[PDB]
Amino acid sequence: LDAQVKLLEFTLEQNFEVVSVSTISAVIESVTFLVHHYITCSDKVMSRSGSDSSVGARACFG
Amino acid sequence: LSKKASTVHMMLQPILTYMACGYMGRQGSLATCQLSEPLLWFILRVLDTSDALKAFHDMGGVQLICNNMVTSTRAIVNTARSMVSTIMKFLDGIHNFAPLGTITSSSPTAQPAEVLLQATPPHRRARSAAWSYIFLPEEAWCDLTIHLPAAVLLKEIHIQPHLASLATCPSSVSVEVSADGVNMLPLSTPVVTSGLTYIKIQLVKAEVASAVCLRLHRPRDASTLGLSQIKLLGLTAFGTTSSDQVSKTSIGWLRLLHHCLTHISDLEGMMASAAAPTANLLQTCAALLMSPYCGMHSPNIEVVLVKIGLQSTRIGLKLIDILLRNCAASLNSPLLFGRLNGLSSDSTIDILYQLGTTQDPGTKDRIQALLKWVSDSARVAAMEYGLLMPSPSHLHCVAAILWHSYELLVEYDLPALLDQELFELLFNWSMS
Amino acid sequence: QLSSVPMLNVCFNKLFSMLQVHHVQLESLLQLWLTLSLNFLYNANRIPVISLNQASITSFLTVLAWYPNTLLRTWCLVLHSLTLMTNMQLESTAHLLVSDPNLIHVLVKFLSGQHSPQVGPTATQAMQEFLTRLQVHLSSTCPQIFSEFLLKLIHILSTERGAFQTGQGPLDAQVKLLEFTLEQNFEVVSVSTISAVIESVTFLVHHYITCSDKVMSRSGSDSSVGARACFGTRDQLMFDLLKLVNILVQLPLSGNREYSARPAYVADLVLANQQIMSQILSALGLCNSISVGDGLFTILTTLSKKASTVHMMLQPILTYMACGYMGRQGSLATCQLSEPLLWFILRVLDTSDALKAFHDMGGVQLICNNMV
Amino acid sequence: LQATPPHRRARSAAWSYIFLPEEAWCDLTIHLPAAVLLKEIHIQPHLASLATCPSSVSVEVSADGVNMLPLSTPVVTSGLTYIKIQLVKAEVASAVCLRLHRPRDASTLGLSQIKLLGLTAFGTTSSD
Amino acid sequence: LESLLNLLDNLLSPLQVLDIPMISWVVMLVSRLLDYVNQWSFI
Amino acid sequence: HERCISVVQKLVLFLLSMDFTCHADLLLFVCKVLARIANATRPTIHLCEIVNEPQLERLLLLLVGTDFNRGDISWGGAWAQYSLTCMLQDILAGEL
């Protein structure tokens, strides 16, 4: 997960000019499907340590 | 996407498509799409401009949201507490129910665990774990079943490991819940608890539970499991321990309708014209007006009701009848049986006053209708629930309407409506 | 006076038919059907009060095959409901379930998976109860399809990028599945599936032994024996898979060599497979002095005992001894020997006939050249 | 580094690291006077307060003592009274970098002792 | 209980105007009487 | 036990008629009273005597239907779901 997040952070700083629309649409489709699955498939229980203070995925305008 | 959409229609079409279907694009009479406060906020932002609102109207948005209001209101039951809860209270943040329960174990040799249920936790430096389990060399899980005297809406489970010796903390915890107390069902895969000074397992969705089975996995680096306290936090159905509205009610549709009617005044008329026709819309809006707060303050609902009732005389008369005579809807059809006819609040009084004292072509007729409801009421007194029990506040509202319209110099023949026969009816009523 | 069961059956069949169009929630439907048909303690031998029809079960399996959000509570409900359905009088329901590929898809999903990867004792016991009920209902009529179903499931889980190979899914449930499978009778099972599972399992175990981690960290409580250690957890799963392979290679073959019988054996087919034998022999050559290496040694010993002729056993051994790492050639390249592998070779060369064949096949010259 | 471990009931961790709120890993590099055939790494967490034990440990080894190389993915160590990381294949090491992950339920990491067990090429310590 | 259930029957006749508060009082009374005559202990 | 059938049928109709103008707390007691009356008659009232096929379908869809339930959000809340389940279970148990 650390390496995947690092990859995403690196990608977010890149310039995507002159990138084919096929790949862009493919990544957008896959990512939207992934995030929809993530939100709909959330676990029934939630257990965090007292140190952990992150905001749940299903929470907006934090 | 909304900012970069070539035209507002591009953004509106997916939104309207979503609003026109139910769960996973399903259809059905009572199926309606899932709304949420963030999604509602986004839709309002998309509908922030006059062009976007005009396109929304042109694409059937107003009719869609009004129909969705009526349907969703039919398809939900109010979870807000009502006079049944009031009566239960009259007959005598979450609450720990572990102390009331009985805690047992499947292992015959386990130490009694009742000390875990005690509401008062042991001293944080207590050198001996309040409860201990000795694992056989072939044992991976030790179970503790807490039976409660009655089912509770369980929301959290707190397990306090022996803080002095965390090596004895369970490596993971599998929580099973039984609503009937007989058939345990795992909530989820075991929660990893090694290295935790406090184990708080929150149920995202509170579950009815009369029994909770905690299966604690042998610690990574210890043959004994030491626990201090177990709390089962939650609520009761009633009593003292019984302490996103857009997602669970139809109020989001009413907030959308209010935004359409009020956000851009110049469009109000058009929006009202698109909203008035839908069947049972006024009954549904009145029902939402007289319901306990569910994410929309009364003034906005009143504004919606007034703007719809004033957009034509027929609808104004229908609204007067709904507020005074019959508010029920005119297995999938809306019912709205839940409310007594003619009940009055500050909101209903204000709506009736605005209907009576707003100057437009229909005002006379509205006043006429009001006066009719008075005479009928008086007539019923001389011998339909709205007639049998006219709100004193509504009668006083009609009186104030008459007074202020007389003092306002209206453009209709107000004195002609107040004939001597009505005056005699009211005199007889008051003397009775 | 009239019974409500027919009406409930109609309603619940309609509800199950509504699952695919997403008009009914799977979790709540399963919970409601379990509650209403249990008459209140659940028990794997209960006949449901409410009987579902074949269409309902097929739709249920299809939805489960595509159902994306199957959490553990959903899985437990699913397993309990499938058990009770096997207890239904519909072709028996168990036959319909096992004959349906969606059942294999569903069990693969279940077994493929801060939470522990496990599912806990309750879900594992529910899976065991479901498999036991399938076995019991199919035993007296057609147990070969149940055994084939188990072997196909284990093959799918063992294939490359499968749950076993990627270390995914509930290890407790996977080990329970293997333990259940090890107690089954594999007679009249097609040789294609048997050979597929043997090949996949041998490849998996060879990968496991060769891809072992560089460091090793156990708690003082842990006292297990590493996989690479003979003549003395994922190690348990691999050992159970090797035990399954050992059981399978002992199966007599039918007359046409297409199904297990009930004097050839699956062991002969395994020995004739050069890739499988190379994998097993190199895996044992990567072991050192019951564990995974013990399982490989047991499989090799069983193959030698069941080999039709000593030549069948000797040929893979001599082929391994005639090549270097991964079958490489070269002047100074020689095969990897280990104390367990050497012990096995000595056991194979224990008889005068085996030694005579070894000599006739150039074994002595091979070993002397290898020594030099 | 002291050869004699502290008292098993020592109430204060021999060494402590205070994690900044954004810090996930704290590193400790032990340089040896000369390269040794490292075989095991022992880390003793503060037994009195196991909540301060690192949640996981990533071991990097440098034969030349300059270029560290992770041995494997981090070892999960939460709930362990003693952390023994055995190298299946002994590695030549002149430096060992232990990257200890912030504990699950504590902002401080408490350690008692670190041992680097192994052999030398020659000398008394050079003991299929 | 016969008379109370006949009263509830008459109050619910509109389903087959409802006075929901009266129905609530009657239903609560009938529940208290019937429970005096374990799964429902949550109420 | 015909009058008991009448009142139980009207109670089921009431359950089926509950919309946002009705409240879950009353629903809990309606379900409890339905179950108790059904099980109090000498020839216990069977679920088939109370509902017809569309009515039973709607009743069960309140529990499992996606037009009335949205995952974490259930119709009438967890207590309403539990009460409906308990009422159905009680009626069937009295039958069986």
Provide the token pair at B24: 């996973």
Other C-beta atoms closer than 10 Å to the C-beta of A25 total 10
Q: Give backbone dihedrals phi and psi of B348, rounded to 5 degrees, phi first.
A: -65, -40
First to last CA, chain B: 68
Residues of B in contact with C219 (CB under 8 A): 220-221
How many angstroms separate the CA atoms of C158 and C169, rounded? 12
Other C-beta atoms closer than 10 Å to the C-beta of C230 total 25
Please report the resolution in angstroms: 2.1
Which residue matches tokens 């595509």?
C66
Report the SS3 class of residue C35.
Answer: helix
Bridge partners, residue D61, by sequence: D69, D96
- The 10 Å CB-count burial string (b at 16+, else e) for B261-275 is bebbeebbebbbebb
- The 10 Å CB-count burial string (b at 16+, else e) for C201-229 is bbbbbbbbbeeeeebebbbeeeeeebbbb
Contact predicate F85/B243, CB 8 Å? no
| Alpha helical stretches, state H, B167-297 | 245-248, 251-262, 265-275, 281-289
Provide the token pair at B330: 């005119």
Run of H or E including D39: strand D25-45
Provide the token pair at C71: 């959490």
Provide the token pair at C218: 């156990």
Which residue matches tokens 């998976």?
C113
Of C32, E40, E42, give the one whose Cα is nearest residue F36. Answer: E40
The nearest alpha carbon in chain F to C11 belongs to: F57
How many angstroms separate the CA atoms of F19 and E20, rounded? 13
Q: Give backbone dihedrals phi and psi of D28, rounded to 5 degrees, phi first.
A: -135, 115
Q: What is the CA C155 to chain-centroid distance, rounded?
A: 6
Asked if D71 has any chain C CB less than 8 Å from its own CB, the reply is yes
Report the SS3 class of residue E33.
Answer: helix
Neighbours of F, requiring at least 3 CB pairs below 8 Å, are B, C, E
Asked if F17 has any chain C CB less than 8 Å from its own CB, the reply is no
Contact predicate B280/B242, CB 8 Å? no
Contact predicate F49/F7, CB 8 Å? no
Asked if C73 has any chain A CB less than 8 Å from its own CB, the reply is yes
| B residues 202-241 closer than 8 Å to D (CB) | 219-222
How many angstroms separate the CA atoms of F38 and F8, rounded? 7
| D residues 24-83 closer than 8 Å to B (CB) | 47-51, 53, 55, 78-82
How many angstroms separate the CA atoms of B203 and B219, rounded? 24
Provide the token pair at D121: 């090429």
Contact predicate B25/B31, CB 8 Å? no
Q: What is the CA C71 to chain-centroid distance, rounded?
A: 24
Distance from CA of F11 to the nearest CA of E (A): 7
Contact predicate C211/C273, CB 8 Å? no
At residue D92, what is the residue type? V
Residue contact E13–F10, C-beta within 8 A: yes
How many angstroms separate the CA atoms of B180 and B208, rounded? 8
Q: What is the CA B174 to chain-centroid distance, rounded?
A: 33
How many angstroms separate the CA atoms of F13 and F24, rounded? 15
Distance from CA of C35 to the nearest CA of F (A): 7
Of C109, C111, C129, C123, give the one whose Cα is nearest residue C167. Answer: C111
Residue contact D85–C339, C-beta within 8 A: no
At residue B304, what is the residue type? V
